[PDB]
Design an enzyme around this catalytic site. Structure first.
Site: not given
Lengths: 335, 335
Positions: A63, A144, A168
């Protein structure tokens, strides 16, 4: 209508969000997070100061990386402060010690530094907020906390913006939470024309211009979840239970180190996402089906890196983890 | 997983050259993503960037342009209808006066808005100069007309329909050509050419690659379709909405001039009848006497300040007949 106002109140409660920060929600839950945070926080820098500075990315997993590559795609000034892949042979799994990179950060000006607290696909969780970023007062932190938002007591004062949606590549579907400094929003406003425009700083679409999002104000759904975590001890409770859940799981795998591999270095082992593999890769489906039989489901690793991944959530019981611990321990002594 | 696409394709005779897809957002989301996407599409076919051109016939196409400018998409107004009657909308200049600005410049695309709601200005026809020019990709916004205006999808590079924040749905019918070319940009040539890059959540070739999509309403979508399909399609719906409007304008036009209709007859909208009282004093009684007959939803747009009559697909002719009667009763009443 406007149950929003109540959910926000719940959040500023369980997280103790100070008056210096504002809670806003955004339709997006994924990719939307990256792009919008890079362009808005670049513009916030141009407001506070008069020039642009590069954005700093700490790439600890998938990510983290995607986030950086999108700031690169948008031609936001940004650089990879480190890539954990480079410190253990192109595979994630470690988080390089501060000393090896902390000086790439100290003294240099940054629009912000990005990190991903919990890297779901690879099971890399930051043990701590890097102290080199905490002590620098002109580095805004973009975090995050997608996996840990309601399960890791953090101090909201240290963060420039906090993001949590999913991790996602979903569409515009879902929602991303934001907790942003009011300093930042004011400064996103206090900048336009030549300033942003001769400097080459990419302009965020107004649909995602953070100050315009707060001014423009199926979501009871989370206000419910906010309420159950409330009373039940809040974030600190849920952390202590998720921590305990993982301790038990990891011990089972570490114990039968003959049989399983935990590829993530203990220092940065994720408590929400446990990643492991069988040394004898001919018994994966035997493992998967025996587990199916036991109503212990959701363990096949993402269809890329493969192997296995056991995800821990607030809703999971310590006894349900111990059921999986039992199977892990039984399957190893069985083979 | 409902392909409501199939009924749209039947509703508009969408050829195999085009692809239907949906995006979350209506409003501004469409402005932003269409300009940077289609700018990239030009860098696809050719090596260079050309300016976008905007046909400003009302407040919505104005705002598209202004957002493309804010974003730094190369873009210019071909005309602005306000200039051809005292800075007021209500007119569309003869294409004589702007034909050659189209035909003798290089444009990424030309943007027009079929129906300007707030001012009741609708294009009588797709401009013949745009259609004959093989080097102009037409980007049309039929946001209040997509189901009540029979069009030829092959003449358009992009048809987009939503309403006039992140809420709602924007519908897209796009040349497959354009998609291949936004995929065929380099990302590096775009940085050099200075072309702003669309966040990948709104990158059209990935939005079509798979999805997810906030649904539940997407069922209502084919619900609204199919009915229209079995009413006689868009042609029937168009004839009906035309009837509702023609009897409405006759009521206004045939007074002893008690009302003003500002839009030129040439470009009067079938969906939004904008009109005003010659003696402004009575505009408060107008609305009360109208509620006395159960006629509501008739007050300006908080900006223009006259009265609006928004015709839609459901509005019965009987309903507009009652409104026709109250216009004809009030003008005689208050002679």
């Amino acid at each position: 209508t406007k149950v929003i106002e109540d959910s926000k109140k719940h959040l500023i409660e369980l997280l103790n969000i100070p008056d210096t920060h504002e809670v806003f929600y955004l339709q997006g839950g994924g990719t939307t997070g990256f792009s919008s945070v890079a362009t808005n926080l670049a513009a916030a820098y141009v407001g506070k100061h008069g020039k642009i500075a590069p954005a700093g990315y700490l790439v600890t997993g998938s990510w983290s990386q995607k986030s950086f590559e999108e700031a690169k795609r948008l031609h936001v000034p940004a650089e990879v402060i480190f890539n954990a892949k480079d410190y253990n042979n192109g595979k994630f799994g470690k988080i390089p010690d501060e000393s090896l990179w902390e000086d790439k950060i100290k003294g240099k000006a940054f629009s912000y530094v990005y990190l991903c607290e919990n890297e779901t696909v690879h099971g890399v969780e930051w043990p701590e907020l890097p102290k080199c970023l905490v002590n620098d007062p002109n580095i805004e932190i973009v975090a995050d906390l997608s996996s840990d938002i309601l399960s890791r007591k953090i101090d909201v004062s240290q963060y420039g913006v906090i993001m949590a949606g999913a991790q996602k590549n979903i569409g515009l579907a879902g929602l991303t939470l934001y907790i942003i400094k009011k300093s930042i929003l004011k400064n996103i406003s206090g900048a336009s024309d030549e300033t942003l425009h001769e400097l080459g700083v990419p302009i965020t679409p107004i649909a995602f211009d953070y100050p315009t999002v707060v001014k423009n104000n199926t979501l009871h759904v989370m206000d419910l979840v906010f309420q159950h975590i409330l009373k039940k001890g809040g974030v600190e409770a849920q952390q202590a239970e998720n921590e305990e859940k993982a301790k038990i799981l990891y011990e089972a795998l570490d114990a039968n180190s003959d049989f399983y591999n935990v590829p993530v270095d203990p220092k940065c082992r994720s408590k929400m996402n446990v990643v492991f593999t069988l040394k004898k890769d001919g018994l994966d489906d035997q493992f998967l089906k025996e587990a199916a039989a036991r109503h212990l489901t959701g363990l096949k690793g993402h269809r890329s890196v493969g192997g296995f991944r056991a995800s821990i959530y607030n809703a999971l019981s310590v006894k349900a983890v111990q059921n999986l611990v039992d199977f892990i321990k039984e399957f190893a002594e069985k083979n």
